[PDB]
UniProtKB/Swiss-Prot annotation:
Subunit field text: Interacts with APOBEC3.
A GO-annotated cellular component: cytosol
Keyword check for Cytoplasm: yes
Protein name listed in UniProt: Dead end protein homolog 1
Organism: Homo sapiens
Residues of the full protein shown: 12 to 235 of 353
Length: 227
RNA sequence: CUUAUUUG
């Protein structure tokens, strides 16, 4: 029989695994995330580039493959894996390492890992979610009103600054530091949902980028090199 | 780089 039916043995295999480590994948309306890593180490990820994200993966692979592939390049603190149902499952996931040295090895090891002859497994980092980015903004409105305009929908905001535009054109950029990933996502989501066009102008909501951040920093160091 | 969570 079979060969014309689904294979539940796959999703059953990881169930038999999570039970033997006691991680018990927490569901998110259908998504899944791993946590509560095995003993042999103690601590918590410090402020570091310990963030890593794989992409362009197979739509049929399970975390029972991606997760061990993470625990071998470095200490995993928390992995997460998501898919969609608009017509077909996606294949993308990310993880946070005990330190950036684990995250740096992971990309340099998994990006160069051809899981299949047709799957150039892509990886990335520095998408910490800890910070939010904005573009366009109001015409002349002050930075104080920008925050207030999004403060009731993102009360987790600790600090924000507006200056270092991506260039070459003017228009500044707004860089918000939230209390948590989701805290920035709750605010970020409201802006893409339609809380944008503040002061009747225009806005574009996006996260930090590894190319954006170096350009941000190269001009941010400017006023910071002195008192 | 062939780049993602807010969610399907």
């Amino acid at each position: 029989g079979a060969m014309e039916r689904v294979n539940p043995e796959n999703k059953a295999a990881l169930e038999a695994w999570v039970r033997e480590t006691g991680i018990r994948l927490v569901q998110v309306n259908g998504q899944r995330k791993y946590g509560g890593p095995p003993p042999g180490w103690v601590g918590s990820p410090p402020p570091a580039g310990s963030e890593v994200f794989i992409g362009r993966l197979p739509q049929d692979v399970y975390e029972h493959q991606l997760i061990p592939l993470f625990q071998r390049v470095g200490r995993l603190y928390e992995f997460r894996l998501m898919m969609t149902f608009s017509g077909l499952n996606r294949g993308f996931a990310y993880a946070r390492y005990s330190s950036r040295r684990g995250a740096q090895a992971a990309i340099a090891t998994l990006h160069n890992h051809p899981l299949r002859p047709s799957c150039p497994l892509l990886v990335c980092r520095s998408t910490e979610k800890c910070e939010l980015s904005v573009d366009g903004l109001p015409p002349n409105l002050t930075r104080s009103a920008l925050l207030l305009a999004l403060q009731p929908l993102g009360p987790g905001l600790q600090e924000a600054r507006l200056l270092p535009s991506p260039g070459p054109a003017p228009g500044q950029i707004a860089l918000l530091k939230f209390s948590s990933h989701r805290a920035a996502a709750m605010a970020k989501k409201a802006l893409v949902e339609g809380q944008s066009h503040l002061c009747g102008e225009q806005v574009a909501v996006e996260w930090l980028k590894p190319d954006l951040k170096q350009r941000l920093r190269q001009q941010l160091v400017g006023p910071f090199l002195r008192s």
